[PDB]
Design a protein around this ligand. Structure first.
Ligand SMILES: COc1cc(C)c2nc3[nH]nc(C)c3c(CN3CCOCC3)c2c1
Ligand SMILES: [Mg+2]
Ligand SMILES: [Zn+2]
Length: 315
């Protein structure tokens, strides 16, 4: 954490880190420093005690597994997209929300084992016996507080008990909303609220749902990058999916097409179905509530057209 303290972002990156399409990929060693800068810009330069902030960040990095997808890179990618959402919609969210939301995005896949909630729930893994719904997401938030409770790690120690419980509730709700099983119902209710004109950001329940969709938009953001970036991320998503599907066939169950490596040919079509049914509706309703988030929708539409090109045999 000591080396992280002297870090300062190069001026060329300051301008590009504000953009939606921004790719963190070529700057591996700058990632912890990129998170510090984003926290200082959105929240404040002395928001947290720098020593504790840097202790927490590095401890979070250490608690991300050597998995192909749900690793340290994924968490920084999710945190960056959130920053760009918060920067373009600043006055709609409180200081406590902006700090909680950036922290939640960095902690959202903490201790992920490269396994879905569906696997754990059927093979009766202790986590499934501990949490029935949103299995991994409840474990991620469990690991978040367990990093905060370490010596010289509680970054929220300056806050009042009322603010500390509010921020932890903001983080719990945020990490839970990353369970894609919850997205479908959440987005439908918001689409109803928008069309009727009943949506009100001063209604705490409505606010939680909008924050929920922001969480999904960020967790899925790898579909809003440039085509060569998105393509290389799809390799990481599937390498993990297949490794899970490999364990499934060892136990005696047949894996789903997305989790079976002997089915790599269905990948462009599987991606197209995911874009039409999940990705595109997500960013469409996000652009409706938050119009400055429109570039996320455009980049996703660009990537759907690219999957449409691979399907037509013109790769
Ligand atoms: C679970 O069902 C699916 C299926 C497919 C085919 C997907 N294809 C994708 N492409 N890009 C993204 C992003 C993405 C996601 C979202 N996932 C969340 C869980 O972790 C892996 C990624 C998918 C999720
Ligand atoms: Mg997750
Ligand atoms: Zn995630």
């Amino acid at each position: 954490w000591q080396g992280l303290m002297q870090f300062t972002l190069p001026v060329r990156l300051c301008k590009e880190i504000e953009l939606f399409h921004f790719d963190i990929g070529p700057f591996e060693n700058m990632w912890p420093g990129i998170f510090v800068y984003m926290v200082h810009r959105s929240c404040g330069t002395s928001c947290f005690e720098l020593e504790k902030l840097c202790r927490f960040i590095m401890s979070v990095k250490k608690n991300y597994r050597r998995v192909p997808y749900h690793n340290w890179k994924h968490a920084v990618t999710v945190a960056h997209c959130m920053y760009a959402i918060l920067q373009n919609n600043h006055t709609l969210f409180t200081d406590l929300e902006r700090k909680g939301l950036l922290i939640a995005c960095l902690c959202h896949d903490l201790d992920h084992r490269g396994f879905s909630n569906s696997y754990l729930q059927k093979f009766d893994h202790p986590l499934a016996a501990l949490y029935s719904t949103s299995t991994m997401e409840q474990h991620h938030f469990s690991q978040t507080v367990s990093i905060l409770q370490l010596e010289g790690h509680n970054i929220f120690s300056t806050l009042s008990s009322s603010e500390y419980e509010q921020v932890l509730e903001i983080i719990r709700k945020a990490i839970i909303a990353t369970d894609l099983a919850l997205y479908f119902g959440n987005r439908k209710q918001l689409e109803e609220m928008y069309q009727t004109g009943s949506l009100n950001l001063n209604n705490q329940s409505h606010r939680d749902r909008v924050i929920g969709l922001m969480m999904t938009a960020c967790d899925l953001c790898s579909v809003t990058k440039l085509w060569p970036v998105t393509k290389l991320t799809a390799n990481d998503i599937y390498a993990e999916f297949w490794a899970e599907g490999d364990e499934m066939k060892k136990l005696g169950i047949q894996p789903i097409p997305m989790m079976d490596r002997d089915k790599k040919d269905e990948v462009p079509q599987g991606q197209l179905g995911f874009y039409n049914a999940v990705a595109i509706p997500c960013y469409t309703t996000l652009t409706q509530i938050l119009p400055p988030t429109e570039p996320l929708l455009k980049a996703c539409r660009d990537n759907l057209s690219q999957w449409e090109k691979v399907i037509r045999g013109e790769e």
